[PDB]
Amino acid sequence: FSFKKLLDQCENQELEAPGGIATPPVYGQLLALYLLHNDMNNARYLWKRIPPAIKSANSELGGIWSVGQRIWQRDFPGIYTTINAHQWSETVQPIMEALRDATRRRAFALVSQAYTSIIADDFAAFVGLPVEEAVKGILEQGWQADSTTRMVLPRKPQQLARLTDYVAFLEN
Amino acid sequence: AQSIDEIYKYDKKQQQEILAAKPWTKDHHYFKYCKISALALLKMVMHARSGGNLAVMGLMLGKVDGETMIIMDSFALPVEGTETRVNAQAAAYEYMAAYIENAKQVGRLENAIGWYHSHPGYGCWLSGINVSTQMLNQQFQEPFVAVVIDPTRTISAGKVNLGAFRTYPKGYKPPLNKIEDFGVHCKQYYALEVSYFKSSLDRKLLELLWNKYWVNTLSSSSLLTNADYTTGQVFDLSEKLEQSEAQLGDKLAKATRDSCKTTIEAIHGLMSQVIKDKLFNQINI
Amino acid sequence: NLLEQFILLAKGTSGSALTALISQVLEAPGVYVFGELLELANVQELAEGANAAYLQLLNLFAYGTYPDYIANKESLPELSTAQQNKLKHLTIVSLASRMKCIPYSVLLKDLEMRNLRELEDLIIEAVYTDIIQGKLDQRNQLLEVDFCIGRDIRKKDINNIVKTLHEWCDGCEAVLLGIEQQVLRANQYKENHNRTQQQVEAEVTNIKKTLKA
């Protein structure tokens, strides 16, 4: 889709540079994209790839890296707290919130799988939404919750040619 | 065509060369394959069933190619044998002497290649007298093979039940599952692998006269009828592979051929299943 | 094979006798396809007059199902136990025509039965008449139908038969075309393998010949 072409554009931008170092905005955009796709190894390697002088010159790189450390340790509740600490540039204003949504979905998976019963406070910390998302669990999704115990209960959700190829390979 | 039209083209130069070389005199385990024509098979079956529970027998016509005995025709000797023994006293010999000349007149260039004989109700094997006769025929007519056909077992089981055997020469010095299937002389002979072949025109008229059993094939559904046969082939192939790797330290080629044959039949069954699913299950939603 | 004997003596009668004969036909066991009788001019002429209810009942017994005799139960004449059982059997046949695994809930709702035991008894007695062949799965609450008789076909849904048979023929043609294409591809692969083997053989014997200097 368009995401593939956008990634191709970033690959082109990274491929050639005046001296192997690109502009700080595109470096921050690449680091944010690496954080978005959960490709954290390339994210940290890009972070150490940045020269120390330009790294210390701008604090936006520091904030992006702090978000990267927060997501590296899988500290879900603190990801939203850290992502809101700083203000991002305008050209990446709407997409970074989208990244938050992505993390949202990630947390949802980590609750739907690997949790038969989850404490309401821990569930709210993982998803980030304080109390209202719990409602979305029962009314919309279809779970069954109960009060006075705060125990959320997640619920776990062309060939003939191939065979001819196999026989042709095996017979010869 | 052309390539599949072979085996019916009979030449005398190659036959003379292999008959003069006599390579079987050195290697006693020479012949391992018996390629029998459809006509010979059909004539053998009908002659064997014609005698009922009395033993009947006849000759074969054919040739030799490498390590393979090719059977192209079958005889019908005028022998009046008992329920367990056939003799061929004096009329069979003159009949087979005259039949070869009569066939030479019309164009049958194949010479005698062996004898076929019926075992009405006692499997397919060589008894003591069968071993003696076959070994004599091999000692004086070196290219030879003894075929035994069971008519009653073939009719009861619904499958062709015949075998081809060649005896070891006297003095050939070199488990418990070869004593009930065969006789006490089971070590005096060996069984050639038997395969059947037909011609282009024969298969043409066979497919032409195939107009009532399409229902049988459209619901044949192998991989269930031949499941036991397939797993038998597989656990024999595992032992064959073990022998091949022991040799490694060409058996591996034969094991690979057997694995390919079993796998190809399995994929043929799967192709039949896929075709049936496309035909009957992808229609009317 | 019993409607013809009724038609033979139904070709001259008309009026109340014709409606009585229609009721007898709907009552007689073994009659489940009232199509040939429905084609008679005497039966079709019943639309005009006070006997249109019997023609409507015959049309219901030929094409309709039991729920169709729910909204207009009072308008149509009251049906005896035999006629109601026959209509329920025809509803079961219609359900089996469109699905080969009928849930018990569908049968209970359509046949208006409050007991599972009586529904299963009705299905068993319908199996006895040989209109349908099948088995009852109590664990899954299902009726599995292997075969069902063809109910009456009117002269407005023959296009459905034409469409289904045309789709079957199209599927057969596509399967044949695919088989031919795969045969051609397999033959091409075999010929390529044989050609490569023979070319390699020719090259090695050529190198062997020139190496013997």
Q: Which residues contact residue B120 at a Cβ distance below 8 angstroms, ignoring those fewer than 6 apart?
A: B48, B51, B52, B53, B54, B55, B83, B150, B151, B152
B260 contacts A171? CB cut-off 8 A: yes
With CA atoms as reference, the chain B residue closest to A172 would be B260
Residue of A nearest to B273 (CA): A160
Spatial separation of the C-alpha atoms in residues B12 and B5, rounded to whole Å? 18
- Decide: residue B200, CB within 10 A, 0-12 exposed, 13-18 middle, 19+ buried: exposed
Tokens for C104?
């018990």
Q: Which residues does B30 contact at the CB level (< 8 Å), separation at least 6?
A: B23, B24, B67
Contact in structure between A36 and A99 (CB atoms under 8 Å) = yes
Report residue B181: phi and psi, to 5°. -70, -30
A 10 A CB-CB count for B220 gives 15
State whether residue B85 sits within 8 Å of chain A by CB.
no
DSSP B128-166: HHHHHHHHHHHHHSSS--EEEE-HHHHHHHSS--EEEEE
Contact status, residue B263 vs residue A170, Cβ threshold 8 Å: yes
| β-pair partners for C101 | C144
Positions of chain breaks in chain B, given as the residue before each break (C to N > 2.5 Å) = 174, 249
| Residue-by-residue DSSP string for A21-88 | ---HHHHHHHHHHHHHTT-HHHHHHHHHHS-HHHHHH-HHHHHHHHHHHHHHTT-HHHHHHHHTTS--
Q: How far apart are the first and last CA of chain B?
A: 43
Q: Is C187 on the interface with B (CB under 8 A)?
A: no
| Calpha distance B67→B190 (Å, rounded) | 14
Six-digit token string for B86: 């056939």
Helix spans in C28-74 (H): 41-44, 52-62, 68-71
Among C2, C10, C3, CA closest to C40? C10
A161 part of contact set with chain C, CB < 8 Å:
yes
Task: Please answer yes or no on whether C186 and A164 come within 8 Å at the CB atom.
Answer: yes
State whether residue B2 sits within 8 Å of chain C by CB.
Answer: no
User: Breaks in chain A at C–N > 2.5 Å: after which residues?
Assistant: 157
CA–CA distances in Å: residue C170 to residues B283, C163, C176: 10, 10, 10
The size of chain C, in residues, is 213
Which of B80, B226, B218 is CA-nearest to residue B159?
B226
Task: Give the Cα-Cα-Cα angle B116, B80, B37 (nearest 5 degrees).
Answer: 25
Give the closest residue to B71 by CA, choosing from B62, B79, B82.
B62
Contact B268 A160 (CB under 8 A): no
Q: Give the residue on C whose Cα is nearest the Cα of A167.
A: C186
Contacts of B32 (CB under 8 A, 6+ apart): B67, B68, B192, B193
| Yes or no, beta carbons of A161 and C185 under 8 Å apart | yes
Q: How far is the alpha carbon of C204 from chain A, nearest alpha carbon, in Å?
A: 20
* Token couple for A114: 């690997």
Write b or e for each residue in A158-172: b if 16 or more Cβ atoms lie within 10 A of its Cβ, otherwise e: eebeebbebbbeeee
At residue C112, φ and ψ (nearest 5 deg) are: 55, 55
Write the CB contacts of B247 (distance below 8 Å, at least 6 apart in sequence): none
Parallel/antiparallel/unpaired status of strands B111-118 and B68-74 = unpaired
For chain A, give the number of residues: 172
In one-letter notation, the amino acid at residue B180 is E
- Kind plus residue range of the DSSP H or E element containing B20: helix B12-21
State the Cα angle at B47 between B45 and B49, rounded to 5°: 70
Whats the size of chain B, residue-wise?
Answer: 285
Closest Cβ opposite residue B275 in set C164, C167, C175: C175
Query: Which of B223, B259, B264, B282 to mutate: most A Cβ within 10 Å?
Result: B264
**Cα angle vertex B247, ends B243, B248, to 5°?**
115
Which residues does chain C have within 8 Å of residue B284's beta carbon, measured at their own beta carbons? 164, 167
Q: Is B75 exposed, middle or buried (0-12, 13-18, 19+ CB in 10 A)?
A: buried
CA distance B229 to B237: 12
Cβ contact C179–A172 (<8 Å): no
Q: Between residues 256 and 285 of chain B, which touch chain A (CB distance below 8 Å)?
A: 260, 263-264, 267-268, 270-271, 274-275, 278
Q: Is the separation of the CB atoms in B59 and B112 below 8 Å?
A: yes
Q: Which amino acid is at B234?
A: V
Contact B283 C179 (CB under 8 A): no
